[PDB]
Symmetry: C2
Subunit: 375 residues, 2 copies
């Protein structure tokens, strides 16, 4: 039983691919084996993504695992919907209801808004990055109307990096007109460290300031720098290192050879990589529930050109979707469940605060219970 699948990994996704490999090994069974066809392309380039998709489609794959950007996301959601091809991705959730798309990343929009009310914020600065879509930006802006907030949204994304200093100085100059002491950083693990470094330089990391890292990887970045500054730092963690499940994973992950497995010789793991590992498990349980359900879907590498007109969707794809979406197992990112669309449900996001001794979970966030503190 050889199930061919596609793999679209953006150049630089070392740990993500390393986690993708480990998953292939941990979830390999005799009943059937998964054959990944890896394609390293610039995820941002919409054209390239189109080729990589049609290429993996002509090779006759049953499902595709990859990533997309705020620019190429529409290409994937569209093609996968037309050709009835299933697409599993750890990337940011789609802004809507796009069929044939499985999203590993839970919606943070809810957990963020809940945290703001917890600290009882009425006036705060919102530094955002247009990389993961302004989905969360619209969230805080719309809620700012109801909850009556004075949000100071600033696009910290279009900042040219070959001279990005007179921009940060002019950034916190506007954040001083209203004496902003409460900032929300909605950026990637990289853009966050850049800001954190600047914050320490200008000395806005002392007692009185309060930062909120708006991502699922609070412990993914370096916090030792703004840890003793005095300013309170909060965030979100999706990979609970307190779970015996995750704890066991790290035991083997931290030991792996960094030569064969790039950026895999650490005690921690980026949430993007952790979702990749959990993605493999979902695809395995899905293709397994099809064998035990006596459902024939097999084909050959002659699906034809994806640009075929009229484009005819192979009916076997409808079943592959109902399989992945029906999957429900336990992974690094807590309980994994899906709805009819592909968005994760019944999940848990731990709320984190940075103390003197280090990060510490002060509670969690459920889609049904909102925020709940753990004494």
């Amino acid at each position: 039983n050889s199930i061919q699948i596609g793999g679209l990994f953006p150049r630089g996704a070392d740990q993500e691919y390393s986690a993708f490999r480990v998953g292939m090994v941990q979830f390999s069974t005799s009943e059937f084996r998964l054959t990944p066809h890896i394609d390293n392309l610039e995820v941002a380039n919409s054209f390239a993504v189109t080729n990589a998709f049609c290429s993996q489609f002509s090779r006759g794959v049953y499902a595709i695992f990859g990533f997309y950007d705020k620019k190429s996301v529409n290409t994937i959601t569209s093609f996968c919907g037309t050709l009835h091809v299933s697409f599993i991705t750890p990337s940011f959730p789609t802004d809507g209801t796009h069929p044939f798309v499985i999203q590993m990343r839970p919606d943070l929009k809810g957990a963020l808004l809940s945290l703001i009310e917890y600290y009882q914020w009425d006036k705060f600065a919102y530094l955002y990055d247009s990389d993961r879509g302004l989905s969360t930006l619209q969230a805080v802006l719309d809620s700012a109307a109801e909850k009556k907030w004075q949000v100071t949204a600033i696009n910290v994304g279009n900042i040219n990096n070959d001279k990005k200093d007179e921009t940060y100085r002019s950034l916190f100059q506007d954040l001083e007109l209203k004496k902003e002491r409460r900032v929300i950083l909605d950026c990637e693990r990289d853009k966050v460290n850049d800001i954190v470094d600047q914050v320490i330089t200008i000395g806005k990391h002392v007692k009185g300031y309060h930062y909120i890292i708006a991502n699922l990887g609070f412990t993914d970045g370096d916090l030792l720098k703004i840890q003793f500054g005095g300013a309170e730092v909060s965030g979100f963690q999706i990979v609970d290192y307190d779970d015996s499940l995750v704890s066991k994973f790290i035991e083997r992950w931290s030991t792996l050879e960094e030569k064969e497995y790039p950026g895999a010789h650490t005690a921690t793991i980026k949430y993007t990589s952790a979702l990749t590992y959990d993605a493999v498990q979902v695809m395995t349980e899905a293709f397994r529930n099809l064998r035990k359900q006596r459902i024939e879907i097999s084909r050959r590498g002659n699906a034809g050109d994806c640009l075929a007109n009229p484009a005819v969707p192979w009916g076997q794809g409808v079943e592959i979707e109902r399989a992945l979406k029906q999957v429900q197992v336990e992974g690094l990112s807590g309980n994994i469940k899906f709805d009819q669309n592909g968005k994760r449900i019944n999940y848990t996001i731990n709320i984190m605060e940075l103390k003197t001794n280090g990060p510490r979970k002060i509670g969690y966030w459920s889609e049904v219970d909102k925020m709940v503190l753990t004494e």
Copy 2:
């Protein structure tokens, strides 16, 4: 002299196509004639747009005139840049510097910001629609930091139209907490 060109018109662009026809007549010369190959597809659908582009490309066109949405725009800008195909469009300007794309619509971002200062606005509501990109939204938000404005941005786009009334009532309910009397409608 027969110059074949592509025409991507979204279903419903009646007046747009009518104006497209009148132009063909008013600017028709003996030196050369333009041969439009019209393709009516759902501009929103990225997949369909890809086919309509490759179809007009296989037919061997010299240039393509059409429209794009906030979703399919990336497809056009990308392909036209790779295949060195020229794309003329009246749609909203691209957020950046994408080669092989001719944009008929001038940037309103500048004219808007200037008008706000003219009326000397410091606190206003900004009802926007995500259809033409949040390019202008970012404009007013970024300027709100410098010029020190209290902007109340509200996405009036995702409003489901088969019950869109308890939403508007709840919309101007928030625009009454601060007694907003100055609204900017950024919509179609």
